[PDB]
Amino acid sequence: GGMIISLIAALAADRVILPADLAWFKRNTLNKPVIMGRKTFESIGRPLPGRLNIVISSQPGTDERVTWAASIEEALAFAGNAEEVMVMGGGRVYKQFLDRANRMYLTHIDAEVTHFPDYEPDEWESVFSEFHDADEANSHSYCFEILERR
Ligand SMILES: COc1cc(Cc2cnc(N)nc2N)cc(OC)c1OC
Ligand SMILES: [Cl-]
Ligand SMILES: [Cl-]
Ligand SMILES: [Cl-]
């Protein structure tokens, strides 16, 4: 019943948008509809297996392995009856969906290194936190966080 729109993003120092983070992203997107910007799809260069790939863009695309949406309302309709839709970037897409999003999956990475939208922390409360030190596989330390709208 109903639908929850969730943002998922890896944020470095500032709002600027690591195998462990990819596992976390895989953990929280698999078996769910996914909405991404055209540039993000280009960067990934493929469809993500195990989920419905919705690419939101003003113009169509030559890749029919994914579904192309012309507006946010079209993208949400393409999610069907899914309980939760994952909005996975990029920065323009996060801007588009922030007001409609009630959940946020954030990975904070300790790297200096296009900004994530500014949001009032007063409107969001943390419902999960987990810190991980860098190790052999991961060059940096990172913190996983899930925020839900007050
Ligand atoms: C799964 O592969 C990718 C995924 C993403 C999106 C993404 C990746 N990580 C997190 N925490 N949130 C996201 N929205 C971004 C990527 O680079 C554009 C990817 O290629 C490595
Ligand atoms: Cl698949
Ligand atoms: Cl729109
Ligand atoms: Cl902004």
DSSP codes, 121-142: GGGEEEEEEEEE---SS-SS-E
Strand partners, 53: 34
Q: Which residue, 75, 80, 83, is CA-closest to 37?
A: 75
Distance between CA 124 and CA 48 in Å, rounded?
Answer: 29
The finding on whether 89 has its CB within 6 A of some atom of ligand 1 is yes
What would the two tokens of residue 46 be? 């493929």
How are beta strands 33-37 and 4-11 bridged, if at all? unpaired
Residue-range domain boundaries for the chain: 1-150
Q: The dihedral of CA 84, 41, 8, 101: what is its sign?
A: negative
The finding on whether 88 has its CB within 6 A of some atom of ligand 1 is yes
**Residue 80: cis peptide before it, omega within 30 degrees of 0:** no
Q: Print burial letters for 68-106: b (CB count within 10 Å at least 16), e (below 16).
A: bbeebeebbebbeebebbbbbbbbebbebbbeebebbbb
Q: Which residue, 62, 88, 85, is CA-closest to 74?
A: 85
Distance between CA 71 and CA 91 in Å, rounded?
Answer: 16
The preferred substitution site among 22, 27, 41 for testing ligand 1, maximizing ligand atoms within 8 Å of CB, is 22
Ligand 3 ion: Cβ-proximal residues, 5 Å cutoff: 71-72
Please indicate if the annotation marks 140 as binding a ligand.
yes
For 127, list phi and psi in degrees, rounded to 5: -115, 5
What is the total residue count of the chain? 150
